[PDB]
Amino acid sequence: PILDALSRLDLDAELLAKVRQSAMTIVPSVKLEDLPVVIKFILHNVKAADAVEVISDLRKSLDLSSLFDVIKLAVRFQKDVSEAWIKAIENSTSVSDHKVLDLIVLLLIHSTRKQTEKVLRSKIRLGCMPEQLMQNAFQNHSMVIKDFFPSILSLAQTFLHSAHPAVVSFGSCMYKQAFAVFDSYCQQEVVCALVTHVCSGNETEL
Amino acid sequence: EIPPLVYQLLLLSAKGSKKTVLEGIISFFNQLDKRQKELDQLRHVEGTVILHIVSAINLDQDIGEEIKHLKTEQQKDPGKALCPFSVSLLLSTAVKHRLQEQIFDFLKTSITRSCKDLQILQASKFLQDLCPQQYDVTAVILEVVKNSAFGWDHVTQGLVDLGFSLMESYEMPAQQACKLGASILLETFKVHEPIRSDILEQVLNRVLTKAASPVSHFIDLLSNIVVSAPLVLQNSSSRVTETFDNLSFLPIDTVQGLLRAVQPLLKVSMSVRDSLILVLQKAIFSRQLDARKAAVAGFLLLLRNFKILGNEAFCLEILGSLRRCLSQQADVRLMLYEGFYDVLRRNSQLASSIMETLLSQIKQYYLPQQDLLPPLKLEGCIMIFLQEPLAHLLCCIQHCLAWYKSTVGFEQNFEEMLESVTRRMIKSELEDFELDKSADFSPSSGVGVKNNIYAIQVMGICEVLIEYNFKIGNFSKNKFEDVLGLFTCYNKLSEILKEKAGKNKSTLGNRIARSFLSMGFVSTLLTALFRDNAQSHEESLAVLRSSTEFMRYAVSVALQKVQQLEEMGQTDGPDGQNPEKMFQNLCKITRVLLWRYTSISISLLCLEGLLRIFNTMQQLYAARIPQFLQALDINVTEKAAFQIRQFQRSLVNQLSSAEDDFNSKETQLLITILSTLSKLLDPGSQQFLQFLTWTVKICKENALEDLSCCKGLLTLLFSLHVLYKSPVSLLRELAQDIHACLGDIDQDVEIESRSHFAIVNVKTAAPTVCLLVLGQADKVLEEVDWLIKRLTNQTQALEKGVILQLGTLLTVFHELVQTALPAGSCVDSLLRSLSKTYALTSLIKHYIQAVPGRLEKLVKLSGSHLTPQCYSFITYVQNIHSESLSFAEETVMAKVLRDTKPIPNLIFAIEQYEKFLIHLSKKSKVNLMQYMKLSTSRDFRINASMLD
């Protein structure tokens, strides 16, 4: 309620800083149904240079636990923090081992793009992001499949056809994984994309 | 017999070959359409064949890739590939879910290339001269919608998808893309009935989550489409209710424009009005600055949304909302003072209640004491911080009082207390004031800024009553001396204390601080002050004219107002958003501004204004130019030619004056005023020429030693001799003078002391001119690359101009690389620009496909005019930088790897051009290298004898 009131109230820098470090200190300690309001506040109410590491603190807070779609909307409400998220995962994947939350939020920012795909290509050439984690993600968190978002992720294979063909195989694997869950209309759209692939282009994607 | 033919062709394409059938059918329907445009029986059959082709590409997807033919046609010669039927066919296929992105980015690059080409042609008539073939994709793509009024559904889907991704790809060619997208969306919304709801849904879904990029296009095209068709939103079941959440993203101007657009639909529909009132009611008491700004912005519009001036519960209920909101901070107290007048122009008794509320507000700081110690209750506006902008409140009070007086208990009290204040300020000088100290102000101090906010607030207090006494009194000497005393208090406390100790450490680029006057008032003041002499004048202006300090302020406020109209699209005071209103105001003030200049600093102020009226006139009121041009007393050129002639007379008299009377500030503005007024002279007028020959002849004769004066005047000459002829003739002559003026690269042979221009003297040949000439030379090379790109029966004509221009252009650099340039950036520009002109390579690279004698002569010229002279420059730049490097602290690594970096790049460009001559010499069976000489390189030997 204090953070909700401060959301309602105006902002002053000196107090905002100390209360926001206090918030970051007290985000993960509470139950998963309680911190989302805090995350929404720090998203649509707070914007600063230090957010580039505050969001990394949030990532560490949410690393363990990973219906709970309010966080997605909170990230939708503002876009500058999403660019900060891209900047943070530019180095978060450089040290941390590509946690599932990283690829989830990467899909979210790519949905809400050019910088995301540039980062994806760079880490394709860098560390290839072991895809068992995203297999588990599509196994458990398939409620946000909505093929229009991963469609660009798949068609990135075309730009990844110049070299490193293994990542094309990983993209094929993850489209195989995403097909066998639900969303029969999305399944037929995936089959339409696949027949497009066998029709246009050379024999490789065929 | 055409439907049977197309039937047998797609039957053949279904199973057999599919290569040349599409080219044949598109060419045939191209000639058919070009005949037809010079009806229904053709539109129906064309729709049927379009549907047949889209069915063919759907079933036989292999007929669409053979995009390659169109791309090759565009590459062979740009433009002649986007035929109306070709673009309609690809637009229909764009919604195939397959190969959309390839076709779509092909269209994107084609349209951006076309808009860039149009920009260049509008920036260069010489290219229009040698390349009359223009392909304006905007027109043909906005013609499809004109033809799409015959039941085309998938065509319309392609159109709307293309527009959606157009706004997506926007973020000046990007601005042109926005214009094209808005146009096509408006056309497809206006004529297509069953998809207009889809268009509304798309534009509603596209505006959200879009604030980093300039998104004014969304609101403006939404306003256009709703003013063309307001019933679409109700047809869409009023899906604008969800948009009310935009109070947190960026409600600085988007909310105002959105409410402006949706005004009629809010009025007709009660449900959306109720949603708006409830959303704003919950928004107002949110204690966020941004939320409160959005709330007050919405209040500024909702009051005038409902009109009763010519349901009474609706009138009376809304009164108390802004009164309650008045208790908030000063920042949110600000805009209500400005916006009160707009709604006060729309009520009779609500106006009385608003005056009563404002009167109760002003009683908070009135201190009724009957002409004693000043009524300064500014102590309340301290919570280092400020709580109420007294100046804005007083300005609103004066403006609303004037409106009420002009419309037809407390009003008599309202006038007398305002009069009492005016009589109190004249009796309260800087002795009863708390801020009598000359240095009590202190930046970054808890008390100094408190004095500063008190100091700035009282300045607005004085300014407002200047408006009151001038308006309440009518040629009454008693009030005029009150105005003098008010400015006497104003200047005595604004000229000194502030901008001495307040803030003047940096030189003030601007002038007397932000003024709270009326554009109507300042127009009346200047028109009554200057260009007005009648018996009604009560000798008050005679003693008023003695206050020359008042004169400077009287016009500097106007410069502030029109500057607001320059940087932004609006201003302050009453009637700040009615474009016709200031247009009349600008039409009126310009004459007296000109009259003051022509009456004979003070005139420097009015002339600077005129420069900014003309700048604002073209940049904002482009459609309203003819009336403004005629208002100075139909062809614009004859009146424009008259206007510059009087400005020409001022320049020729001013330039011919002695150096002691040059007043450079005047010269820069008058030169720029011509460069702005000469923009709108039409191409098909003789006055174009005698003016153009006048600025040339004034350049040949006049010898001005000022630098910005020469730079500004040259820009005008090169901003006009860029749409009439080829500027390379002028550039060569300038280069002829620079080489003659300066020394020689070899300092052994003496250049004849010619003088093609008198402006270029021993001083002006500095980077002042040598950077402008190389700037123009870079521009010419930039468009030549486009011509070379276009070059890669009309081809022969293109090669004629390019060889001729590059031949002249080579004579420019040959005579310019031989110049003994001084050190600094002028040397660096030449070395890099020399790297540009050689990249001569692309033209050679293209002609590998083929030889002509003219091209051989160019290389003969290039070999004998550029390369041997170019290497001599490098042997000279090594010693001029050695001399320049001795003046270090009299690390250095910065100044050694920065003055020498261009040299390796220039070497690479020479050899790359040299290398591609090898390819042509062998292939074209002609040896073209006897003209040139061997490549020269350089070595060193560290002088260990003089090591230390």
Protein described:
The PDB classes it as dna binding protein. The entry lists the keywords ss-dsDNA-FANCD2-FANCI, Fanconi Anemia, D2-I complex, DNA binding protein. Ss-dsDNA-FANCD2-FANCI complex. This is part of a larger assembly, with chains A (206 residues) and B (948 residues). Helices cover 68% and strands 0% of the residues of chain A. Chain A has twelve helices and no strands. Chain A has helices at 2-8, 13-25, 35-44, 51-61, 70-77, 80-95, 100-111, 114-126, 132-140, 148-159, 166-179, 184-199. The relative contact order of chain A is 0.07. Chain B has 948 residues and is mostly helical. Chain B contains 44 helices and no strands.
Give the percentage of residues in beta strands of chain A.
Answer: under 5%
**How far apart lie the N and C ends of chain B?**
96 Å
Q: Which range best describes the helical content of chain A: under 10%, 10-25%, 25-40%, 40-55%, 55-70% or over 70%? A: 55-70%
Q: Count the helices of chain A. How many? A: 12
**Largest sheet descriptor of chain A:** none
Family (chain A): Belongs to the Fanconi anemia protein FANCD2 family.
Protein name (chain A): Fanconi anemia group D2 protein
Subcellular location (chain A): Nucleus
GO biological process, one term (chain B): DNA repair
